[PDB]
Chain A
Amino acid sequence: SSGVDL
């Protein structure tokens, strides 16, 4: 799982 801003 991960999370990032464009």
Chain B
Amino acid sequence: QSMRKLHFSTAPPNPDAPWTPRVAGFNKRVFCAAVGRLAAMHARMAAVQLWDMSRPRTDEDLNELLGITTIRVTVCEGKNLLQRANELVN
């Protein structure tokens, strides 16, 4: 279900309406999913870069690369969080 377009619930009638427990749970899952997807995408991009620069071509190369792999990513999309997460491919 990482194909699924992420959207917060449309059930609350207005911006200040208290969420039902169902809606709160639903929105929590959507929030966390979006953050996770963006983090995965940026980390994979970093990994591709690191791999391409290293160009491992033996198991020994790969053992070495694993030892130095330290990938740092930040998710910071503000109000565009879901839009950005939905735009992702693969």
By size class, the interface of chain A is under 10
**Residues in chain B near residue A6, CB distance under 8 A:** 70-72
Q: List residues of B whose CB falls within 8 A of some A CB.
A: 38, 42-47, 49-50, 69-77, 84
Count CB-based A-B contacts (< 8 Å): 36
Residues of B within 8 A of A5 (CB): 46-47, 49-50, 69-72
CB nearest to B54 among chain A residues: A5
B48 to chain A, nearest CB (A): 10
Enumerate chain A residues within 8 angstroms of B73, measured Cβ to Cβ: 1-4
- Most chain B beta carbons < 10 A, residue from A2, A5, A6: A5
Query: In the complex, A3 Cα to B77 Cα: how many Å?
Result: 13
